[PDB]
């Protein structure tokens, strides 16, 4: 017997993604983490989006 994910993974975009998509037609996923780590000066993220 083996464990598997019971349900599809629900990934939804943040409001900054919405406004960036409306303006420039592009999105950076996990946008708030990018902003916070970039401003704080931390070079690396814990995981991908």
């Amino acid at each position: 017997t083996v464990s598997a994910p019971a349900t599809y993974g629900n990934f939804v975009l943040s409001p900054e993604n919405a406004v960036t998509a409306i303006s420039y037609h592009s999105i950076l996923a996990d946008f708030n983490s990018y902003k916070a780590h970039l401003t704080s000066g931390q070079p690396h993220l814990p995981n991908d989006s």
Binding site: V12, L13, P15, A18
Partner: protein, 49 residues
């Protein structure tokens, strides 16, 4: 009326009546919407923001 001499032709006419009809002038203006507008207005989704 006004009175006059003993034999001047003072008219017997009194309180005449007249009819006034109505003049018709309808006005018109169109406004138009696209199919995408009506669709997004009508079927509100459970989708994201």
């Amino acid at each position: 009326r006004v009175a006059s001499g003993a034999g001047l032709p003072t008219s017997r006419q009194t309180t005449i009546m007249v009819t006034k009809y109505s003049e018709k002038s309808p006005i018109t203006i169109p406004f138009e919407l696209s199919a995408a507008c009506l669709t997004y207005l009508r079927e509100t989704f459970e989708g994201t923001i």
